Amino acid sequence: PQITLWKRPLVTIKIGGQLKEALLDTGADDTVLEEMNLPGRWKPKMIGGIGGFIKVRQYDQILIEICGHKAIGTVLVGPTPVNVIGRNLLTQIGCTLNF
Amino acid sequence: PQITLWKRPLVTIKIGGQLKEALLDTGADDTVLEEMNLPGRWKPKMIGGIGGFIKVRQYDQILIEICGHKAIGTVLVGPTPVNVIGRNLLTQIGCTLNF
Ligand SMILES: CCC(CC)CN(C[C@@H](O)[C@H](Cc1ccccc1)NC(=O)O[C@H]1CO[C@H]2OCC[C@H]21)S(=O)(=O)c1ccc2c(c1)OCO2
């Protein structure tokens, strides 16, 4: 689809079998989701944003479907203010900025 | 143009007579720029992201040029680690997400 930006670009995603709402976030290198339960191994990591750094759990090679488009990549889980889909997955679904 | 997301979507902007680099950021409601001494009145504001909140100064009706596309709107100035162009200005230059 073509998505305008008068509203937040929120979309439904599927991860671990469960549906969620997430923000398409071209300013995020990485995908960060709010606290949730995910199967498989993970490693502790740090990520920094506008206000400082937080502790996250890094899940690699996770299946996630974004607005009907499949991706498999890294998903960080931790105290982000909102679920964000970052460039690591936006590239996988073929997302570009256009003006 | 069309901007892929393999790397950060950085572009040149012109604001307050200065050229700078800024992110085209669909996850940013507002536009936040590095500390710069703009003239005129302002109001304090707090904006939150990963890591918490930062204090910024809100200037209204600021002229910004983004890749030759002119816009005018609110700009927040503060100790942000990165300049981000938010949706308030991305809509004005006709920017969409597409996949
Ligand atoms: C609430 C949704 C986002 C937080 C997730 C909000 N951010 C915009 C993001 O695009 C920032 C924009 C950003 C980009 C680099 C550095 C600081 C901020 N990116 C970000 O935080 O990404 C992190 C996850 O991937 C990593 O790659 C970059 C940092 C990491 S933000 O910078 O904090 C921001 C910008 C304008 C705003 C605002 C919050 O409140 C209203 O106006």
- Contact yes or no for A98 and B3 at CB 8 A: yes
Buried b (16+ CB within 10 A) or exposed e, B1-27: eebebeeebebebebbeeeeebbbbbb
- How far A20 CA sits from the closest chain B CA (Å)? 17
Dist CA B76 CA B59 (whole Å): 6
The tally of CA atoms less than 13 A away on the side-chain side of residue B39 is 3
A39 C-alpha vs ligand 1 centroid, how far in Å? 27
**Angle ∠(B20,A24,A35) on CA atoms, nearest 5:** 115
Closest CA to A76 of A27, A40, A43, A39: A43
Dihedral angle at the C-alpha atoms of A51, A57, A61, A66, nearest 10 degrees? -50
Q: B53 burial class (0-12, 13-18, 19+ CB within 10 angstroms)?
A: middle
Q: Which residues of A touch B27 (CB under 8 A)?
A: 23-28, 84
Q: Which of B32, B34, B47, B50 to mutate to test the pocket of ligand 1 (most atoms within 8 A of CB)?
A: B50
Taking the CA of residue B31 as reference, the ligand 1 atom at the shortest distance is 36
Atom 16 in ligand 1: which residue has the minimum CA distance?
A: A49
Dist CA A92 CA A4 (whole Å): 20
Q: Which of A24, A84, A89 to mutate to test the pocket of ligand 1 (most atoms within 8 A of CB)?
A: A84
Q: Which of residues 35-74 of A touch B (CB under 8 A)?
A: 47-54, 67, 69
Closest CA to B96 of A96, A67, A68, A66: A96
- Domain range spanning residue A49? 1-99
Identify each DSSP E strand in B1-99 by its residue range. 2-3, 10-15, 18-24, 32-33, 43-49, 52-66, 69-77, 84-85, 96-98
Active site residue B25: yes
φ and ψ at residue B12, rounded to 5 degrees? -85, 135
Residue whose pair of structure tokens reads 């690699």 in the numeric block: A60
DSSP 8-state assignment for residue A86: -
Domain tally, chain A? 1
